[PDB]
Amino acid sequence: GTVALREIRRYQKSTELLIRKLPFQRLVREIAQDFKTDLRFQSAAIGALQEASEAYLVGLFEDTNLCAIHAKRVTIMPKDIQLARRIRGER
Amino acid sequence: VLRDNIQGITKPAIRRLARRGGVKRISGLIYEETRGVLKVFLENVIRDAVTYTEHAKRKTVTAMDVVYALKRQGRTLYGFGG
Amino acid sequence: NIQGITKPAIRRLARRGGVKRISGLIYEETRGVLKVFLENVIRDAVTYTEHAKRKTVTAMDVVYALKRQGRTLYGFGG
Amino acid sequence: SRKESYSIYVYKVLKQVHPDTGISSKAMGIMNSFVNDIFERIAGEASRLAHYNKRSTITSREIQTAVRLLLPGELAKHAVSEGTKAVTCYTSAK
Amino acid sequence: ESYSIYVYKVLKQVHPDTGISSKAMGIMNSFVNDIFERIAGEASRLAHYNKRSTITSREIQTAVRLLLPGELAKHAVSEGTKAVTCYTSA
Amino acid sequence: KAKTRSSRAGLQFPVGRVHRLLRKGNYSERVGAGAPVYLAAVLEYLTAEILELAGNAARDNKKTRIIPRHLQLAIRNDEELNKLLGRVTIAQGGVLPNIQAVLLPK
Amino acid sequence: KTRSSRAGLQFPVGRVHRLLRKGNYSERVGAGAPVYLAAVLEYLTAEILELAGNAARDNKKTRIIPRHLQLAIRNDEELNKLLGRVTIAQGGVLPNI
DNA sequence: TTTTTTCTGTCTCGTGCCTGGTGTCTTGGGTGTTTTCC
DNA sequence: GGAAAACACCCAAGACACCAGGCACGAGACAGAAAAAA
Numbered sequence: 001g002t003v004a005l006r007e008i009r010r011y012q013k014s015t016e017l018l019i020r021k022l023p024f025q026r027l028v029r030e031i032a033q034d035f036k037t038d039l040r041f042q043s044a045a046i047g048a049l050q051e052a053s054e055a056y057l058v059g060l061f062e063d064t065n066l067c068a069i070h071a072k073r074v075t076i077m078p079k080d081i082q083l084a085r086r087i088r089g090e091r
Numbered sequence: 092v093l094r095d096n097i098q099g100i101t102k103p104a105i106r107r108l109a110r111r112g113g114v115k116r117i118s119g120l121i122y123e124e125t126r127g128v129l130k131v132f133l134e135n136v137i138r139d140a141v142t143y144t145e146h147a148k149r150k151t152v153t154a155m156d157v158v159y160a161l162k163r164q165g166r167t168l169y170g171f172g173g
Numbered sequence: 174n175i176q177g178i179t180k181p182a183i184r185r186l187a188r189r190g191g192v193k194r195i196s197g198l199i200y201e202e203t204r205g206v207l208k209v210f211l212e213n214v215i216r217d218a219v220t221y222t223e224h225a226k227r228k229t230v231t232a233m234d235v236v237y238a239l240k241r242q243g244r245t246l247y248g249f250g251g
Numbered sequence: 252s253r254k255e256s257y258s259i260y261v262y263k264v265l266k267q268v269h270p271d272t273g274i275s276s277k278a279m280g281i282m283n284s285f286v287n288d289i290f291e292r293i294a295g296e297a298s299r300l301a302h303y304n305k306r307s308t309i310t311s312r313e314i315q316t317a318v319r320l321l322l323p324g325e326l327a328k329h330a331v332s333e334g335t336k337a338v339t340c341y342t343s344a345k
Numbered sequence: 346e347s348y349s350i351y352v353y354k355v356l357k358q359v360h361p362d363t364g365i366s367s368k369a370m371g372i373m374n375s376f377v378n379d380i381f382e383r384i385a386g387e388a389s390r391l392a393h394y395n396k397r398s399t400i401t402s403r404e405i406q407t408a409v410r411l412l413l414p415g416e417l418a419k420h421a422v423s424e425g426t427k428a429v430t431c432y433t434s435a
Numbered sequence: 436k437a438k439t440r441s442s443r444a445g446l447q448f449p450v451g452r453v454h455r456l457l458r459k460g461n462y463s464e465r466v467g468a469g470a471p472v473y474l475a476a477v478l479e480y481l482t483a484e485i486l487e488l489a490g491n492a493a494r495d496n497k498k499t500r501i502i503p504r505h506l507q508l509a510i511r512n513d514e515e516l517n518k519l520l521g522r523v524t525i526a527q528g529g530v531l532p533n534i535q536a537v538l539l540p541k
Numbered sequence: 542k543t544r545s546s547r548a549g550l551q552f553p554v555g556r557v558h559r560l561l562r563k564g565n566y567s568e569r570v571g572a573g574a575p576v577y578l579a580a581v582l583e584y585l586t587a588e589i590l591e592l593a594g595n596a597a598r599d600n601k602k603t604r605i606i607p608r609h610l611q612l613a614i615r616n617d618e619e620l621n622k623l624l625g626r627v628t629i630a631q632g633g634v635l636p637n638i
Numbered sequence: 639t640t641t642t643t644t645c646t647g648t649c650t651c652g653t654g655c656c657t658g659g660t661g662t663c664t665t666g667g668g669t670g671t672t673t674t675c676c
Numbered sequence: 677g678g679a680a681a682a683c684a685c686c687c688a689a690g691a692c693a694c695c696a697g698g699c700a701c702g703a704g705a706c707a708g709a710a711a712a713a714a
Binding site: 149 | 683684685
Binding site: 005008009012013014015048051052055056058 | 606607608628630631632633634635636637638
């Protein structure tokens, strides 16, 4: 439990990206391949996608933590994920 | 060809992202659901970005298109032009 | 006249949403959030009217303000 | 002065798709508001997207791309097909 | 085009001894462009509503009250008004 | 005989009206010729779909009157139409009947 | 000679006027609109840079970082209310446990 | 008894023709940015 | 981290198809109104 708070304190003060660059790059290319072939990508576009996806996931985890806190639990569950997404309006 | 690459988003990476959000304990079923959510979000952004590239008769996705597209999804990004 | 939003009326409004049981303390909370929402929409409609050099708020100002807040209303001349 | 509306055309297409069904005045108001709102959305998206490529013209391409950007799913594809059908029909006549 | 020089001028006005990174400069440029787009678009929308073809100080002022929240907007409106009389008295 | 552009393209919606509204609605200095035809066709197809589903929903209710209730039913019961018209409130449309499963007694 | 010096502003009034003219918003633009818009932009940028410099001083730094901009924006009720739907690149998150 | 379709008077906005400028398109060359590979 | 390849975006010149602009005609859209059905 102690190192959980240590990880929270370390990562909430840091600003570098936490998603590894090359798997995310391959993921973006794999997703984009099935819309159009032979697609090129600027590096800045991949970086913008990485930053936006990280910000979105951080916000989703914060709202999910609020939902978990509501049910008198400390562990987040998938039902919290779809609860937050449903209330936030995603389908 | 690329096949089954979403698993490249590792489990410690999801752990670090949850730690940034202040989550103390993590269930084992969170990772697959998180991967699905990330895939849905990426597909939604990439669809609009590739449409913007196709209209301009370009063959490369630029940063401006990705900004414009997230802004069109209500997810405005500062720092990459606009 | 915030007490004019009576307890059976807010009970009916909760009942349309599919709610089975109602806490006794919730009514003041619903009155507060309704007051906040009405305050925001009324403020925007009033400044729209003041820009329009008019002395009477019309439905168009209300629908405009609501649509500008992402709460687009159909049926009132939009 | 008068005020234009889409009431007659909505009634015409309703009589085309459902000959035995009428429509109330309130539903006419909702349909008019719906058509106007969709018009503003597509026109604004086309105007923006045209401004991105430093172009001065809204053509069929800009409207088509705006339709693909807004309409969600198969609806877009169906709309695009019919729109192309209308354009070539116009192009086939004079 | 960029707003780099003007942001540098106002930065050295408010903080002569403080520097700024390039990423922060890009962030400032994006912020200024976004705020400009919002205010100008809402002013145009107001001009379209009132059947007007001219954007004057009025619609800009009301757009400023419509978008910016609280005290901020008031001081901004005051600042804009002062600029207008400063323009008028020069 | 000066035939209407709507009759030339086989549409019921006014091509001239959308052309005038595009030209007068402060978007861009000049407007291409095919854009009003395309926009009118898109508006036609969409209003046809909405009115079709609403007439069907009225038909299950054994009514010959389309009311806002049927329009709300038609919009919310179709997935893609609900996605498109997500953030709109239909006046006098009501709410779809939905009661949760565990809300019910045993 | 310049309109900026006449209005006592540092932002370019001519640039705002040119963007309004070629931005396809309306047919004509009054003389007071670009001056007013430039004044609003200058006041807002001065406010946010002031709060960012204060945050940088509190963090014992001499150069403003996007971390400092994120902290300055998120610690201000009016600014974060204005910028609720904005995510700052390389800004991180606000420390909250 | 009232909501609503159809008839009619009326008008204004769409159609049609000519002109005229010019925005868009094409072509040709070149650097440079991104992909590929160790 | 290095090292090419090359593909593709940027830029300049010229040409013309196409859209705005001016204006006349009118007939289809809008309101008044008359009647029918529930």
